[PDB]
Amino acid sequence: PHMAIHILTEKEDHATLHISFNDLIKIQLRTNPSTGYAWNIEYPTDTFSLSQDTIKAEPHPSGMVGFPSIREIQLKPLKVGTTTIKLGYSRPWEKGKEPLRSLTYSVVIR
Numbered sequence: 001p002h003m004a005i006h007i008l009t010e011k012e013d014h015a016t017l018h019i020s021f022n023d024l025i026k027i028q029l030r031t032n033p034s035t036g037y038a039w040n041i042e043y044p045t046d047t048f049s050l051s052q053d054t055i056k057a058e059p060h061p062s063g064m065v066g067f068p069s070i071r072e073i074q075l076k077p078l079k080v081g082t083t084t085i086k087l088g089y090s091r092p093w094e095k096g097k098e099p100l101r102s103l104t105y106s107v108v109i110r
């Protein structure tokens with residue numbers, strides 16, 4: 001046993017992550033707020049607490065400001081068990097339609 005922070009990105013789509021009860025999951029995704037797109041996260045509310053949610057300019061601003069930005073969400077397990085996290089990249093004015101891109105992660109909290 002020990003605390004670990006597990007970093008998930010776009011590249012880990014469909015991965016299954018095994019974590020301990022005192023771990024953190026840190027999802028780090030690029031985004032371009034000036035296009036109106038944003039990531040939306042869904043998970044069971046009785047399963048994780050949001051320990052931090054952040055949008056920030058890249059630490060090496062080579063290109064234009066805010067392009068891209070980094071969206072980071074850090075989740076802490078509330079309960080042990082198995083759960084799924086879904087992300088969608090879309091504009092706000094969507095009538096529940098399909099997002100431009102989707103990500104899915106499976107999490108086993110042991």
Ligand SMILES: [Cl-]
Nearest residue numbers: 031038039071
């Ligand atoms: Cl975002």
